[PDB]
Design a protein around this ligand. Structure first.
Ligand SMILES: Nc1nc2c(ncn2[C@@H]2O[C@H](COP(=O)(O)OP(=O)(O)NP(=O)(O)O)[C@@H](O)[C@H]2O)c(=O)[nH]1
Ligand SMILES: [Mg+2]
Lengths: 131, 185
């Protein structure tokens, strides 16, 4: 059992490495940048936010599935790793954010609203400079 | 897989997903804001949906308030999956829309993606002298015929707040009702 839990620990660190790396992080960032435009910093959400959250869920499932298959980690191992307290302490809040955003719409919305604020600000700075 | 990811949450078992449904003008957003101790005086018709999280009786109640206009109702089913509790709100004083809301409730309770979900029916706007009693609305809806789930009807006023907590108290005793029934199944 102790050796079996060491293997869980490997699985946790492997998942953590994936969530830190470009294979995961860059498709996520591309999605967030390309879809954040309709997310207004306002209390009430639009019906389209849900449609977009569904695509996000699909992307996340797709990325995770490829990872689990290319690396050779089955679903049961994946679940016992995500269940381990090591999953929380070996990953950071920032690394977990786009992962939690798959199940937690409130987290997803804040992430999209934040990216839209940033990209609008950059668009404004450019207009500011061209005159 | 996506459902495994819930294991990465701070306290995933303390979290309750509540779907708040009903006809346009029933008082859903007003109820939601009362629950969240927010100002209710600048509320307009909901064109999408609101979410508010309320900590109550040892649970985090995540409440999804969906717009009730007819044009929005085809989108209601986008919100059915992973619902723990259904709260259905009725304007007790709009008798002309009782049939419309009776039909929406009936369809919800036949919905496969809401099977085993406990339903609280809030008979709202009881502050109004025109309000039908909950007893009357219960009869009119034939609530006694509801099978394969627990249910409750509660007289309330989202505007005054009266009766609201009594409904929410029922909800809190029934946080595990859905998963207990689907484990039975
Ligand atoms: N007298 C009285 N008026 C109420 C009560 N609850 C809500 N109202 C009023 O009824 C109107 C509709 O309220 P609202 O919360 O917007 O309803 P809704 O169900 O969210 N509508 P929609 O689904 O279109 O967004 C508002 O004028 C609100 O003040 C109540 O208990 N008593
Ligand atoms: Mg509303």
């Amino acid at each position: 059992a102790a050796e079996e839990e060491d293997e869980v620990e490997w699985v946790v660190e492997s998942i953590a490495g994936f969530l830190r790396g470009p294979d995961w992080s860059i498709p996520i960032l591309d999605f967030v940048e390309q879809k954040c435009e309709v997310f207004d910093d306002e209390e009430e959400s639009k019906l389209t936010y849900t449609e977009i959250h569904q695509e996000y869920k699909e992307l996340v499932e797709k990325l995770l599935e490829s990872y689990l298959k290319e690396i050779g980690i089955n679903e049961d191992q994946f679940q016992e790793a995500c269940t381990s307290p090591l999953a929380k302490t070996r990953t950071s809040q920032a690394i977990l954010q786009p992962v939690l955003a798959a199940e937690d719409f409130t987290i997803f919305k804040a992430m999209m609203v934040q990216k839209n604020i940033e990209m609008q600000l950059q668009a404004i700075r450019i207009i500011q400079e061209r005159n | 897989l996506l459902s495994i990811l819930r294991k990465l949450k701070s306290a995933p078992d303390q979290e309750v997903r509540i779907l708040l449904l009903g006809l346009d003008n029933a008082g859903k957003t007003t109820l939601l804001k009362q629950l969240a101790s927010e100002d209710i005086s600048h509320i307009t018709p909901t064109q999408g949906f609101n979410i508010k999280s309320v900590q109550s009786q040892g649970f985090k109640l995540n409440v999804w308030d969906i717009g009730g206009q007819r044009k929005i109702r085809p989108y209601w089913r986008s919100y059915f999956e992973n619902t723990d509790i259904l709260i259905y709100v009725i304007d007790s004083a709009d008798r002309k829309r009782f049939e419309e809301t009776g039909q929406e409730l009936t369809e919800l309770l036949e919905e496969e993606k809401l099977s085993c979900v406990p339903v609280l029916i809030f008979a709202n706007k009881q502050d109004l002298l025109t309000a039908a009693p909950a007893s009357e609305i219960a009869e009119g809806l034939n609530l006694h015929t509801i099978r394969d789930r627990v249910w409750q009807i509660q007289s309330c006023s989202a505007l005054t707040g009266e009766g609201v907590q009594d409904g929410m108290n029922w909800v809190c005793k029934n946080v595990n009702a859905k998963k207990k029934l689907e484990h039975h199944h």
